[PDB]
Amino acid sequence: MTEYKLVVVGACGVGKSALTIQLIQNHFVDEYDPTIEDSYRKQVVIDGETCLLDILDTAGQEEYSAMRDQYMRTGEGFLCVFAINNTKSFEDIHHYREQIKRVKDSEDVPMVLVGNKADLPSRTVDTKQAQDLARSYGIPFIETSAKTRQGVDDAFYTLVREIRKHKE
Ligand SMILES: *CCC(=O)N1CC2(CCN(c3nc4c(c(-c5cc(O)cc6ccccc56)c3F)C[C@H]3C[C@@H]4C3(C)C)C2)C1
Ligand SMILES: Nc1nc2c(ncn2[C@@H]2O[C@H](COP(=O)(O)OP(=O)(O)O)[C@@H](O)[C@H]2O)c(=O)[nH]1
Ligand SMILES: [Mg+2]
């Protein structure tokens, strides 16, 4: 079967681990150690294709390193996650997109913008502002809740479809 290597990136606390564990293990984690960086795998069917999702949930220190560049470079697509109630996490996205372009040495890398925690009140990032950003990047934007499951499959499956488009 076809393997898709996905990498989940974004600020501490946006829900990278919760999104990954909801997709792979079908449950919402109320807490997940922010030092646990690992890959999680699941066989799924997307548009009739049986495939293996190989998802790297990034964690540890906010730092640049050749060591990290080496394994991040293996990613075929990037899920760029911010939390809709954390303006700083939205502002951070630019730094992730720029480093993805650097490590992949390309202006054309499969990417999806994800606004997580859609279930929470008191949002600080307007959906239309995130939609405008995604339009400016030429990538899809999906609002998700790792808690309720809203948009979770759509976010990961859309990234798989972006990877297929790049492979042509
Ligand atoms: C609370 C812990 C947690 O969940 N964290 C996510 C993070 C670990 C990794 N992550 C991170 N932050 C940034 C950058 C990268 C990054 C670094 C590389 O060397 C290579 C690549 C390649 C693609 C995407 C991202 C990277 C990173 F993994 C780069 C800039 C954005 C910040 C940055 C300012 C260092 C944070 C802690
Ligand atoms: N209400 C709500 N809480 C969430 C959601 N996603 C993550 N969380 C919570 O936010 C915190 C940070 O999530 P985590 O997955 O550890 O974020 P990470 O640091 O990006 O891996 C945890 O307490 C999660 O339970 C969500 O969609 N909705
Ligand atoms: Mg985590």
Swiss-Prot record:
It is a lipid-anchor. Its EC number is 3.6.5.2. The modification N6-acetyllysine is found at K104. Acetylation at Lys-104 prevents interaction with guanine nucleotide exchange factors (GEFs). Lysine-depalmitoylation by SIRT2 promotes its localization to endomembranes in endocytic pathways. It catalyses: GTP + H2O = GDP + phosphate + H(+). One of its GO terms (biological process) is response to mineralocorticoid. Belongs to the small GTPase superfamily. Ras family. It is linked to Leukemia, acute myelogenous: A subtype of acute leukemia, a cancer of the white blood cells. AML is a malignant disease of bone marrow characterized by maturational arrest of hematopoietic precursors at an early stage of development. Clonal expansion of myeloid blasts occurs in bone marrow, blood, and other tissue. Myelogenous leukemias develop from changes in cells that normally produce neutrophils, basophils, eosinophils and monocytes. Leukemia, juvenile myelomonocytic: An aggressive pediatric myelodysplastic syndrome/myeloproliferative disorder characterized by malignant transformation in the hematopoietic stem cell compartment with proliferation of differentiated progeny. Patients have splenomegaly, enlarged lymph nodes, rashes, and hemorrhages. Ras proteins bind GDP/GTP and possess intrinsic GTPase activity. Plays an important role in the regulation of cell proliferation. Plays a role in promoting oncogenic events by inducing transcriptional silencing of tumor suppressor genes (TSGs) in colorectal cancer (CRC) cells in a ZNF304-dependent manner. Interacts with PHLPP. Interacts (active GTP-bound form preferentially) with RGS14. Interacts (when farnesylated) with PDE6D; this promotes dissociation from the cell membrane. Interacts with SOS1. Interacts (when farnesylated) with GPR31. Interacts with RAP1GDS1. Interacts (active GTP-bound form) with both SHOC2 and PP1c (all isoforms) to form a tertiary complex; SHOC2 and PP1c preferably bind M-Ras/MRAS, but they also bind K-Ras/KRAS, N-Ras/NRAS and H-Ras/HRAS. Interacts (GTP-bound form) with MAPKAP1/SIN1; inhibiting K-Ras/KRAS activity. This is GTPase KRas. It comes from Homo sapiens (Human). The gene is KRAS.
